[PDB]
Amino acid sequence: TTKTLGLVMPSSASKAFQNPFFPEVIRGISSFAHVEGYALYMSTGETEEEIFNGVVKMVQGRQIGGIILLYSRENDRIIQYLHEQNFPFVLIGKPYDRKDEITYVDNDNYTAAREVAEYLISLGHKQIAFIGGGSDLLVTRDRLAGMSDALKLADIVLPKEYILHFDFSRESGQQAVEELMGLQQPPTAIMATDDLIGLGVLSALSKKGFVVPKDVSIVSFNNALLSEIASPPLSTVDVNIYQLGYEAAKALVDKVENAESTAKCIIIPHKLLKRQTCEGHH
């Protein structure tokens, strides 16, 4: 037997490592793999087809004992594959369906986003926008869902033009600001589902001569080191990336070694850190 664990990204390891979420999740993954003498393995394919092939060779090689998926996408072929080959794997993120069958690690993203939206609403904001990554990712749907419900519960409208999907990058944050700040009735607060987008939102808002947070409040997610040092420092939700990783690996090795298993879900705590990007609105 060989103990190595496979890691699967949502895209090229090169795109992934530009996002500080990933080195931190891997850092948690590794910290545990160490405890049980497991090593790590990832494929290099950039393309979706290439990433599939990647996972397939992993399973075909009989050298990988288990696989951690660092993401959760709707209709992931990767999951259809692993489920059919009966290969041991674990999610970081809610699965679209079969919660009962799949073992996953996640934050309560629905509630984190609800809480962020409650936070802004208690601040008197009534025109609140959401900027996320892919629609097809479940962390995005959930984060959307929680802020959305929070708005409907306080009787606050959420127009289609305040909901944005882009990839997670700074540029995304800049195009969002173009779109949002370009409307006839723009938002006064903004929730970004990723610090990269937060950081970009900030620069873009500042290139246009706005001031955060007097003109626009921003909350974002993930606590990137960069968020601490942004000017002004970003309110963000710490989502405990490392523990997501550590706990994912601990769940997988258990699944692999025990080999008779029950599927559970593991919820790692989040924390809203209010730094400097939010101001009162009343």
Ligand X SMILES: OC[C@H]1O[C@H](O[C@H]2[C@H](O)[C@@H](O)[C@@H](O)O[C@@H]2CO)[C@H](O)[C@@H](O)[C@@H]1O
**Positions in the binding site for a second copy (CB under 8 A):** 99-100, 149, 152-153, 243, 246-247, 262-269, 271
Q: Which does 168 bind (CB under 5 to 8 A by kind): a second copy, ligand X, none?
A: ligand X
Nearer to a second copy by C-beta: 157 or 183?
157
| Residue 248 binding ligand X, by CB under 6 A | no
- For residue 61, what are the contacts with CB-CB under 8 A and spacing of at least 6? none
Q: What is the CA radius of gyration of the chain?
A: 20
Binding track over 178-217 against ligand X, x by CB under 6 A: ---------------xx-----------------------
22: three-class secondary structure by DSSP: helix
Concatenate the DSSP letters of all residues of 176-197 into one string. HHHHHHTSSS--SEEEESSHHH
Q: Residue 185: is it exposed, middle or buried by C-beta count within 10 angstroms (0-12/13-18/19+)?
A: exposed
- Using CB under 6 A, which of 32, 38, 71, 89 touches ligand X? 71
Binding flag, residue 106, ligand X (CB under 6 A): yes
Q: 38, 89, 162, 221: which one contacts ligand X (CB under 6 A)?
A: 221
In angstroms, give the least distance from the CB of 9 to a second copy.
Answer: 24
* Contact footprint for ligand X (CB under 6 A): 16, 19, 21, 70-72, 92-94, 106-107, 109, 133, 137-139, 168, 193-194, 221-222, 239, 244
